[PDB]
Amino acid sequence: MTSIHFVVHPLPGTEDQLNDRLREVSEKLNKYNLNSHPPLNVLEQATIKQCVVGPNHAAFLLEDGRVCRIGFSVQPDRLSPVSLGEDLQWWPDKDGTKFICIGALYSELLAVSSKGELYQWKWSESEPYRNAQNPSLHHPRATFLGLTNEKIVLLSANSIRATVATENNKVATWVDETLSSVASKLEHTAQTYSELQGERIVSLHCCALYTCAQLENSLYWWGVVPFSQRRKMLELYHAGAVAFSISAGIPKVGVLMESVWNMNDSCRFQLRSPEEEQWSLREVVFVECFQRTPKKLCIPEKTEILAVNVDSKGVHAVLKTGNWVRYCIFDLATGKAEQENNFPTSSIAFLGQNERNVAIFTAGQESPIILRDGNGTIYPMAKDCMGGIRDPDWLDLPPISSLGMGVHSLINLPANSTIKKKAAVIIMAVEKQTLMQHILRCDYEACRQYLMNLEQAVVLEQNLQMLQTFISHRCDGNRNILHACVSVCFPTSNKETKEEEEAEKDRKANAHFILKLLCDSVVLQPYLRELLSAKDARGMTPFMSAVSGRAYPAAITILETAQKIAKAEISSSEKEEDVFMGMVCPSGTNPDDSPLYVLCCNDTCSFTWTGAEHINQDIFECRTCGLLESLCCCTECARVCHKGHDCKLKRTSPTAYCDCWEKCKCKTLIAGQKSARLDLLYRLLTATNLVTLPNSRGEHLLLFLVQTVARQTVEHCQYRPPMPDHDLEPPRFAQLALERVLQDWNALKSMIMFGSQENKDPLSASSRIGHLLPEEQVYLNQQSGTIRLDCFTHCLIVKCTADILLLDTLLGTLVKELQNKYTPGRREEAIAVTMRFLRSVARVFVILSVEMASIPQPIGKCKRVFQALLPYAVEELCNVAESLIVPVRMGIARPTAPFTLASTSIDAMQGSEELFSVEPLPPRP
Ligand SMILES: [Zn+2]
Ligand SMILES: [Zn+2]
Ligand SMILES: [Zn+2]
């Protein structure tokens, strides 16, 4: 059962207004109850195969061959939105013949039946045309087209022209009866093109001027030569020509009497009766330079083709190469790929369950493009400041069984109004998924009654076909019921976070109760593993979506549910850790999409604690979003925002105040619950192994946290206490995160033993050495890396001169693991970790002491570290001095220039910053 909806989109418009109309339909489905029409209720209980839109009428083709039509009127436009006709009447079918295809022209409605008969119905006439002389003949031009001796299959209809095709590779075309005067030389009857032989034509799509035929592995076009190729023809039109235009929703034929020299202007055409207007030459095609032969489009070899639709801009195609999907726009001037675009989401989620649901919908020249993916949902397309596809914002819509749109022209416009003349009318037959809509409407009672009814039905009749059909239910962006519940559970306001800072509807609660009800459901137990281990269009599980969307109690509930389910299904291989990591953070995942890393880098945006001020920050630039000249963004914007974009850091940074909300939707303006965030960090530290995996910049979590702390200490001291809200405190989470992570013998071990043999850094040249000579592999495997460890030690000691607690935390963890005579192998492991850390501390201390003249705070911190670990620091300092004194005694010292010492401490820090804050050599691409 499906429901019918009407969308009015005035022309000319952008994709943003169309997306706003689709969104308005989406919340009218979601939060505005339900509404329909009396005469369309009979259409709701059947599978509508095809919907077409005429000038003032709409036609529906069903599965059983019944065709119905209705009238409508659209008043408002732009500087229910439609009025429907009172009664619906059907096609007279006393002969009992079912119908296969329908199509809409301006003056007639076309039908193709199973017996190969073409039927024509006038819009003005209330009864379909039947010839009295020939009872077996029904189309008035069937004799002229010569289709009476061949069974007919494929139809394509548009505003003025129609193109039709048999089984015998015979294609014909004609124009509407309102242009019968110029219909002597623009058309052709059924030929047999030898160039199209070899493969059956699988689809035909007609534009307003030309038409296209898609075969099994080729594309051909024929018809009117486009306006871009008229430059070479005039590389200048004499008077006396006869032309036609389709402007303002009406087709008209005129005659020229001026001489034309420049073709970029507008010309005045004398009107011709069907038995004197100023028209632009871009919408005028001279008839009395026509591509009467099919021309092959250039496509790459071994590429499957999915959906073809044509318009004035060219040929729009979806191409599949291997396991990848491109979107292509072909220009008819050269026949090559004019525009090539890659989808910003995953291709696997775009392919969906079935590849036959991918389609492209358009209505004419200026009409927009609606793309339908493999799941039957709408993929919203928009253009960024560059020439790519913007990141899509999901509409939360059910899949569409049938979609059809057309161009309508408004009637009797006043002369003193700026209302646009033309619009597009879109008709949707959206499916209903009742528990999906119950989840999206935030109602606990309907979900509870549905689960109780399903449990009673399984207990009584033992039927699970409806349940296994409901498991495969999807929303937009490849989202299941759990994904929809998580997306509903996102925080919206900052009221609780605003009120907790002092002296220091019911949608959310119903959503949480719904999540608990589906988590503790008895009947949903054998499918919750497949529900939780599913990836959406961004490649995230519901736990990853709850972490990234700042829904922390939802992530806590999902984590307990995964821990409960995973312990009862070990049995065979693919064991407990494999099931748990499949549910939490699966393999083949980007390192910047880890739940621990994302949980660490979700901080409050800097406009929330700085208004229109001009404090000193770090300034990032996006090429994609348009933050180019004076528009800027804070560092948390570069972390959470702009993750797949072309975002860079500018060295010449003046003062700015995060102009990120002006150009895009900043995802960091709202802070979630702090206690649930710390509890999630506590649970993720002691249950997974996500802390030993670096991010896409090759940084450990400890290095990222200490760099965030060292940046925020400098940035947050210029906060003055009293369009988005700017009355919140600066974020304090990274200090507590460092204090918790440093109390762990996995993170400290992986940080200190970084760059060793059993630790791979993706941005190091020594990581990928398997294709080299064996001697070079020996020379590269002799050494070990200590760049990032030295950077971490320098950032902990020199750049963190506002706290001491992290150093005592690290020293306490080291001493506690050194005094552990309980588990085997712990003591020597802690000894080696202590040796590596003391080597790094000794190197930093030596550099700082050489740079200073004849105590500073970092030297005091190094002395405290040496005093807390005396019997090993003495030996490592002996080794450091021995290494320093070797080249003097052997007389092989490298000559250097003299330098002056440092009287103050800021210049020594400036000189040691350039020595330790470096990067290893990247591998060869
Ligand atoms: Zn951006
Ligand atoms: Zn920001
Ligand atoms: Zn931002």
Swiss-Prot record:
N-terminal signal peptide: none
Residues where N-acetylthreonine is found: 2
Zinc finger regions, UBR-type: 603-671
Residues engaged in binding Zn(2+) 3: 637, 641, 660, 666
Residue list for modification Phosphothreonine: 541, 561
Coiled-coil annotated residue ranges, if any: none
Subcellular location per the Swiss-Prot or TrEMBL entry: Nucleus; Cytoplasm
Modified residues (Phosphoserine): 80, 273, 367, 487, 653, 764, 784, 883
Binding sites annotated in the UniProt record for Zn(2+) 1: 605, 634, 637, 658
Binding site for Zn(2+) 2: 622, 625, 642, 645
Tissue distribution of the protein: Widely expressed. Most abundant in testis and expressed at high levels in brain, pituitary and kidney.
Description of how the protein assembles with itself and partners: Homotetramer; composed of a dimer of dimers. Associates with CDK9 and TFIIS/TCEA1 and forms a transcription regulatory complex made of CDK9, RNAP II, UBR5 and TFIIS/TCEA1 that can stimulate target gene transcription (e.g. gamma fibrinogen/FGG) by recruiting their promoters. Associates with the E3 ligase complex containing DYRK2, EDD/UBR5, DDB1 and DCAF1 proteins (EDVP complex). Binds TOPBP1. Interacts with PIH1D1. Interacts with CIB1. (Microbial infection) Interacts with human T-cell leukemia virus 1/HTLV-1 protein HBZ; this interaction modulates HBZ stability.
Functional summary from the UniProt entry: E3 ubiquitin-protein ligase involved in different protein quality control pathways in the cytoplasm and nucleus. Mainly acts as a ubiquitin chain elongator that extends pre-ubiquitinated substrates. Component of the N-end rule pathway: ubiquitinates proteins bearing specific N-terminal residues that are destabilizing according to the N-end rule, leading to their degradation. Recognizes type-1 N-degrons, containing positively charged amino acids (Arg, Lys and His).
The record's note on its domains: The UBR-type zinc finger forms a pocket that mediates recognition of type 1 N-degrons. The UBA domain recognizes and binds ubiquitin. It acts as an ubiquitin acceptor required to place 'Lys-48' of ubiquitin into the HECT domain activie site, thereby potentiating the E3 ubiquitin-protein ligase activity.
Family: Belongs to the UBR5 family.
Designated name of the protein: E3 ubiquitin-protein ligase UBR5
Source organism per UniProt: Homo sapiens (Human)
Entire-sequence positions represented here: 1 to 1523 of 2799
